[PDB]
Ligand binder design. Sequence first.
Ligand SMILES: *[C@@H]1O[C@H](CO)[C@@H](O[C@@H]2O[C@H](CO)[C@@H](O)[C@H](O)[C@H]2NC(C)=O)[C@H](O)[C@H]1NC(C)=O
Ligand SMILES: *[C@@H]1O[C@H](CO)[C@@H](O[C@@H]2O[C@H](CO)[C@@H](O)[C@H](O)[C@H]2NC(C)=O)[C@H](O)[C@H]1NC(C)=O
Ligand SMILES: *[C@@H]1O[C@H](CO)[C@@H](O)[C@H](O)[C@H]1NC(C)=O
Ligand SMILES: *[C@@H]1O[C@H](CO)[C@@H](O)[C@H](O)[C@H]1NC(C)=O
Ligand SMILES: *[C@@H]1O[C@H](CO)[C@@H](O)[C@H](O)[C@H]1NC(C)=O
Ligand SMILES: *[C@@H]1O[C@H](CO)[C@@H](O)[C@H](O)[C@H]1NC(C)=O
Ligand SMILES: *[C@@H]1O[C@H](CO)[C@@H](O)[C@H](O)[C@H]1NC(C)=O
Ligand SMILES: *[C@@H]1O[C@H](CO)[C@@H](O)[C@H](O)[C@H]1NC(C)=O
Ligand SMILES: *[C@@H]1O[C@H](CO)[C@@H](O)[C@H](O)[C@H]1NC(C)=O
Lengths: 50, 50, 254, 361, 49, 120
Amino acid sequence: QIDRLITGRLQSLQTYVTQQLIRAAEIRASANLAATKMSECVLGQSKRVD
Amino acid sequence: QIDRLITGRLQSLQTYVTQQLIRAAEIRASANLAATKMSECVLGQSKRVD
Amino acid sequence: QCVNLTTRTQLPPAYTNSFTRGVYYPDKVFRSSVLHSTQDLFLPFFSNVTWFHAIHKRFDNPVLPFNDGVYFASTEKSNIIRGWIFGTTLDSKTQSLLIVNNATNVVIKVCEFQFCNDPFLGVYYMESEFRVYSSANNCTFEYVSQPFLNFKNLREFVFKNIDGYFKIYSKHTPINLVRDLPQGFSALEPLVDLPIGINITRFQTLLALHRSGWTAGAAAYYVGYLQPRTFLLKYNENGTITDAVDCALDPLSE
Amino acid sequence: TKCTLKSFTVEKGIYQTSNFRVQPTESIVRFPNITNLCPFGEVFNATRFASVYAWNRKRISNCVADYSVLYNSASFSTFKCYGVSPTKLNDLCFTNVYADSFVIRGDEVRQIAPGQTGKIADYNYKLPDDFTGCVIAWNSNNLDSKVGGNYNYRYRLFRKSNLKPFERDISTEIYQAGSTPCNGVEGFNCYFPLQSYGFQPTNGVGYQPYRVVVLSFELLHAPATVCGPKKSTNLVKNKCVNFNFNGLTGTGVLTESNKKFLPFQQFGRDIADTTDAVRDPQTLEILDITPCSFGGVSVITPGTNTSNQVAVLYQGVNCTEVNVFQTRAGCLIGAEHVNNSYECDIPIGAGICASYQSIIA
Amino acid sequence: DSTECSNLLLQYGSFCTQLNRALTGIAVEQDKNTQEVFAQVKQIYKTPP
Amino acid sequence: DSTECSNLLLQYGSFCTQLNRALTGIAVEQDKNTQEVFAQVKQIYKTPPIKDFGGFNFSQILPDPSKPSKRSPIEDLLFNKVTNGLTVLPPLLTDEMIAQYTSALLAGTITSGWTFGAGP
Ligand SMILES: *[C@@H]1O[C@H](CO)[C@@H](O[C@@H]2O[C@H](CO)[C@@H](O)[C@H](O)[C@H]2NC(C)=O)[C@H](O)[C@H]1NC(C)=O
Ligand SMILES: *[C@@H]1O[C@H](CO)[C@@H](O[C@@H]2O[C@H](CO)[C@@H](O)[C@H](O)[C@H]2NC(C)=O)[C@H](O)[C@H]1NC(C)=O
Ligand SMILES: *[C@@H]1O[C@H](CO)[C@@H](O)[C@H](O)[C@H]1NC(C)=O
Ligand SMILES: *[C@@H]1O[C@H](CO)[C@@H](O)[C@H](O)[C@H]1NC(C)=O
Ligand SMILES: *[C@@H]1O[C@H](CO)[C@@H](O)[C@H](O)[C@H]1NC(C)=O
Ligand SMILES: *[C@@H]1O[C@H](CO)[C@@H](O)[C@H](O)[C@H]1NC(C)=O
Ligand SMILES: *[C@@H]1O[C@H](CO)[C@@H](O)[C@H](O)[C@H]1NC(C)=O
Ligand SMILES: *[C@@H]1O[C@H](CO)[C@@H](O)[C@H](O)[C@H]1NC(C)=O
Ligand SMILES: *[C@@H]1O[C@H](CO)[C@@H](O)[C@H](O)[C@H]1NC(C)=O
């Protein structure tokens, strides 16, 4: 019974960590975009449209 | 018997959803690139090489 | 002792709207400022509840199937409704549960009773007439407790038979409406859980006669049936259920 | 840190190596008041006991039963159980108890047993082969015996067929010893079945009257109303203890609570369905259950080529619950806090950084 | 359509709700992607005849 | 705290180590993200005490000296509009230091143009 609970909770924890890694990749992409906008719009004048 | 079938089908569905999330992240990156090309190549003239 | 009541007036039973009544606390758990979704035997919102009258000449004491649970609503003045009759065959062949509130206390007994076909009490204008049973042979459980009890009082009851446990939920509400069920919200607190362990499939209300033949005092009560469904219950800061959502009523509440 | 990194050399940085736990110190079991005791005083110590052909059956139900007082009593000369254990009577729960009380002879005390064959077993009181419960018997020569002879206790001597288990027979039909017709009229070979005992104070051990109470247990689908006593301990607050409140167990710090429960409510839950509030069953007071201060143990070090000095970070742990400095990241032990500001070398968190120059934070 | 399977599947908790939420997020993300790429003008311009 | 559960959990190996290492990588990645976004200048610039910018008003974006958090009114409104083994590690940069970084960036782009992003 404890083995069933262990494999269920381990599957839940692996699912949480996997979706956290996917969201971390998305947030890293958004933060790389934000650093690019910080460099190009604040620290200079950008010719790039929109 | 249904416990074995349920854990097999749930593992298959979780694998499918994880692969779909990774491919959706890739397609989102491609679409952000395409929106950037739409802004900077169609709506303006770009000095960025290639 | 049994007496046939032969001065009744024939009338079909009535029906009315449940509104948002019949909600009870599903558990003994305090919850603070949270919305809790629970799956239990609940009374459906705005449902068709059976309406019985006692007026003069109406005297509604039939036997109804218990199903999975009973919601009992009572628009009561001068204490006509005194108890309920619980069992399966309501004779000495099986074992039956008796809930009575006489002039002193409430008595709960699980025995083999011989019920009359028309059981009632009676008040002479002083209660001096008890004709609800003729025998009591084999008792297994006795429990004496504190008494639970224009229409001035509203009495809601929920009876459930789950795993040999008899749950009685109740709420007292002061109302001043004349005829029908008032529209509002009142969650029923758990009063007492009974270790009865018996089969119950049929039930019957117990009334009281008024003697001065017989006269039926003005009373009205309502029977609703509990169905397995989901409620989204709202718990306030003080931990009382102030509002509920029936998840299978309409797509908005879904 | 070398054990965690599986290397003998540690690069400069902060490394989460272990997990600080506030270990539970005491066990607190609070169980409600032991009231509504089972009426064993009117069964074992009644005024007059019954005969064995008409043994009195008392139903013990809807009460809590203290078998330790019955078991620790030294007056009982026989305490033999056949389906349960005597030391586990206070732990197990049963639906109901049947108490069969009678008086027999001292030589017939062994005859109340499964598989035992005797006159009392065949004609007066029979136990099944799968009997559960305990048989209790004690000498009653000072009470039942009379100097003129106590003839009030009768017993059945003859019957055509043996008893079924837990079967009574109070009939007074005249037995047929021979094959002669008897219409209830006694004759040469027709005798009355119930005979009186010869209980006298001049009799030795074996003929003295013994009072026997037999407890039988039922384990049907009815709820287990009969349970053993609950030994509740004292309540200890403001410490990381193991709490057991009315079958709800856990580990936490039990502090006073400002949450006013409604009187029908016993436990309290937050949004995430974890029990954070509870009511003590002994005294109706509300207690908050704060989880013990678990934390991550991080080791802040420079390179082992540089130095062997380390600092320890207990994450989210106050410094009074573990060169001691309190940060918003946690308690940092082994680093000297300075008022100067430098560039971040080893990140601690919440604006705190560590560097080596000794280890400063 | 097996109700015993769903009764056993409810013992595993909210895995199915998580998977449906992830697929719903992907499904609305595709429409967001098309909206971001192609709907960069609020005026429908027309060429001269 | 069940020791039998941990004895059975040791049969599955180093799954817990992988989960902890993945979460640690995410946790340091968040601080790296904040470091790449906000810490683009190594000089903390300040505006002059006299706000004579030829009619241009920056009071809604410059830090308010009356507030203890040293935030701009816009940043204060932005911060007002956002509302079992589990631990939350605090971020390495506090909100005060991120506000200080944005104040330095605002002072640089107001007083010095784009010159501070390419040199002195
Ligand atoms: C009250 O009326 C009921 C119904 O007519 C009576 O119950 C019947 O009594 C007769 C008496 O011989 C029986 O043969 C029937 O089988 C009974 N019917 C049922 C459904 O049980 C009842 O006896 C009447 N009460 C009195 C006091 O006469
Ligand atoms: C810059 O803008 C601020 C804000 O709009 C101006 O401050 C206002 O000044 C008037 C009169 O001095 C007051 O009635 C308002 O209450 C002020 N608003 C706030 C939000 O403080 C300020 O005058 C402008 N000019 C300069 C030179 O700072
Ligand atoms: C309730 O039931 C009765 C008969 O069963 C029916 O005539 C009536 O219309 C029902 N009420 C509602 C609101 O459906
Ligand atoms: C109420 O019922 C109980 C049990 O039947 C009885 O003992 C008591 O006397 C009754 N009260 C009156 C006033 O008759
Ligand atoms: C039930 O009652 C009947 C009649 O009173 C009796 O013959 C029978 O033995 C009883 N059964 C039990 C189990 O008490
Ligand atoms: C309860 O009673 C009903 C009708 O009398 C019967 O159909 C059902 O099988 C009974 N259940 C049990 C558990 O005795
Ligand atoms: C909660 O209780 C307090 C006092 O006990 C009262 O002032 C407040 O109005 C209550 N709130 C609700 C929503 O009942
Ligand atoms: C008689 O037996 C009962 C058994 O419950 C016990 O409580 C009581 O103390 C006994 N009486 C004496 C005088 O020992
Ligand atoms: C239970 O026992 C305690 C012990 O003193 C007492 O204070 C309390 O009043 C008793 N009753 C209840 C209902 O807690």
